[PDB]
Amino acid sequence: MVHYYRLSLKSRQKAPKIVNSKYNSILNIALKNFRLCKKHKTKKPVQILALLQEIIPKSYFGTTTNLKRFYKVVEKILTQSSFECIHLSVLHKCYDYDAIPWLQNVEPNLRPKLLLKHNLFLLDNIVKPIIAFYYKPIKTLNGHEIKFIRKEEYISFESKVFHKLKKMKYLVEVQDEVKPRGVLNIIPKQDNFRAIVSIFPDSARKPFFKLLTSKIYKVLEEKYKTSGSLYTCWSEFTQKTQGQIYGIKVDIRDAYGNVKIPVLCKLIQSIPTHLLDSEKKNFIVDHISNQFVAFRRKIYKWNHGLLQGDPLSGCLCELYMAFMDRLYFSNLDKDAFIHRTVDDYFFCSPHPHKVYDFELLIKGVYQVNPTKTRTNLPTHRHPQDEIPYCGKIFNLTTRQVRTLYKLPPNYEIRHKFKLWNFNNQISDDNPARFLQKAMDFPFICNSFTKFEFNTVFNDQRTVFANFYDAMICVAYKFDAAMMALRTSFLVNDFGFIWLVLSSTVRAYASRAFKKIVTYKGGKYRKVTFQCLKSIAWRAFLAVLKRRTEIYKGLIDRIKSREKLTMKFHDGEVDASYFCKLPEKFRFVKINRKASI
Template sequence: MITMTYFRRTQRTQTTINEYFSLEPINENRKRKMRGLSLKQQFGSEECTEKYKILQDILKKSKDFVKDNPHTQNVNFIFMALDQIISDKYFGSKSNRKIFYCTVKKIIRRSRFECIYRRELYQGYDYTCMTWLTREQDFVVVNEWVLNRIVKPIINKYFFAMKDINTNYGLKLIPMRKWFSFQTRVIQNMIKNQHLQPLSCNPTCIRGKLSILMKKDINNVESYRPIVLLNKNSRGSESRKKLKEIAASIRKLASEMCDTKTKYFYQEWSKFVEETGYKNIYGAVADVKDAFGSITTKKMSNLLDKLVEEKNMESAKGYYIKAHIRNQNVIYQFTRKGIPHIGRWKHGLLQGDILSSALCQLYISDLDRQYLTGFSQNFLLHRSTDDYFFCTTNREDLTKFMAIMKKHYKINVNKFQSSIINDNILLYNGNIFIMGSKEIKCHYKFKKGSLMKHKCKFWNLRNQ
């Protein structure tokens, strides 16, 4: 998931942006710590002071504003809201308000892993304008409380934060109304295409909550990735441990089934280059389209039965896996009253499940065992989940590989690459492979105009 720091308290204590924007599950203790103390808990001993009354007024206006303004369209709405919620008495001057808004802008525009310092909360302010402030050193505590109890709830109420697909570390704030509309349209589309089957009765076994990730554009309902967020109750259970053990055994079996390498790519590449010497090499890269979705329950069950017959798998384990993939029940939506809508996932393997990735590898390895054979000795065949990299010194082998992939695999034509067609250059695993010189270069691809801080990781939180 996304990790990025919005706020640094001390040299080693920080609060992450994914928590600030509610991008990942947080335990209750952490939630309380992140939310901060309530007004009474924080400033209860100062109830009669002007400071307490100002903060009480800000809190009341915040609640009223949320009730009166259910929707928003853009990020500037946050500052319009703060204009109405935080009174001039709090800041004392326009310049102080401007400094505070600059801090809010930094929070909104941060990239993942980037930090802002605690000094942002007190440096540059004119304290003489704040008649309610008795001690200057108290202002940083009050300002932090306003950020945690006023600004953060507004951002989480009106916006959904997600990774910007055009950059490595950028974040994008999408109005919550648009995000809910996108999710609803995607769910309707999944039900229409029979990828998801709504259930009238509540099953005993529910895998988790179905999360929908946008891949390209929010207006494109075909561009999404469904991933299940597993139930918290099952994270430390015995069944989870058992599933992890089964997944490990499946991956081991998948790696032994065929000649396709699935680990240590750069070691394999170096070994291949060393063995080929000065010979010309030819290569191709292929991407299997919708790898998880194309593996139906029936196909997987037939493969498991075949492996049991070949004595490559115990019958009890095969039966357990089949029972597991038949019951891919998920919560896909909630009503306004919080009642869950439960459905059964019918479009292949459910991404995010403990066994899905291992079973996908097993199924594709079985295809490799059947079709990707008969090449000469000098070749390298590597697969990273559903991406293939093939290299050989024999041009006929390359032609054969391309023909097999197009005939027996459902490949993404737009992502298919060949060194013959693509000027001896291949893109794989985030790198550029130059077949002529056998060099490897990092592949940087960013949208024009992207900020440098969204392209690279400048902060290492472990060492700060």
């Protein structure tokens, strides 16, 4: 069954003092040096690879080549994404067994099993714990990216935020005679922080909550006549509006924490009797206040709106926010464009003054991030035609919609992808399946919607750009699969790749063709399967070229075997777009190296 070792620190073990009957005594030395390293207080920054090379004696590996093989694993762990694994067989395949001293008294055929077992011990008891001792792993939530923050820096940060919450209303010290139902976690968020709770969970039953919130999502679409579909709204809006569109996007600051608890309670109380009535309402009422959380041995009451992390917060915040909408957003206009999420409001009208009446109004209702506001109003400092909202870029002038990406500088794009599924494991000798599973559609589905492929409001040149961009993402996933195929499946002949790559271009071109047909509108000119296939090949070429030495032969095969030229039907097309990496994709990091 089991093929994978998970790279996550979460699975580390607490090391014994010495080892048992099973393990060779050499592991005791490393355990010792591990404890010694932890006790040594040094002024100058910690390089894990360098420490580990003092902790695990060289006699454990016998040769530099063996040592270098183990530490490539350590190096992945030092650079892991969430959910990433390697194969368990990486830990024994291709080691120089004749050169490992502690293994000479064992006949050759039992060696790999022992090496695997001891390697696992080291990684579980020494490598992962050393990292945990010096670093806090932080999920940036930008894909599966993990950042490793020096533990003293994090604790300092964690304390500095803890006192701010203390010396505000947000966190009040409790007498311990309340008993918490989750632990307060402080997460660094770019410039600020996020104070969420991790539940045990259990709490009576988890299905009780799921069919409790299910009772609420009813109420949301009952006494609030809201419907809303971003695509339908934008489409119906743009088609009736002939003149220049004006619009604004307003970022709502901490919607969860700006919930006025008393107001939400009265909202819950009355009147959903046919829907919830009393036994439920009473449990929700006291749930919103008081919210009590475990921390540093101490128990605290959270007095700043809903707690992010509580299962009910999301649906109750939506419930609350819909009420604020009926309350303060009543005189907007039946003919204006409006759409919202918990974090977002997006409003458009051909009447510029209404876009002010909206900006001013929304500032009166909510606390909003005013630097994160985007508008094309000429009175603003820096007016802007293109408005990002819900993973999309809306151009208020051209009405075109593009997918938003989405990439900090220095971001390693391999973090966007999930190649390893611990629940559905692929043996080390089926790389083709791994490849094919990686090229499956579901992951890229939100780049392949009516927003990207319609020709109602979007021009055909826009559909092509959207498509080319989605295929650049797919190509980067392909590239990241290639890296995994080399370092974990240990592939050396990449021949089988050609036909998998070819099928993939065929399949994505075909899904595009269908989507374009289904959502065809008056702006359609003529899209062939051939044209789409070429855009796709071009997208792969623009990524593969980033490793011309590795991908030389593949690039040449594409240029000699595939059709890369296409006929365009709009003279307004930017033909250059299809020649090169677009700048938003041009400087993502594709090289993996340890930095702690």
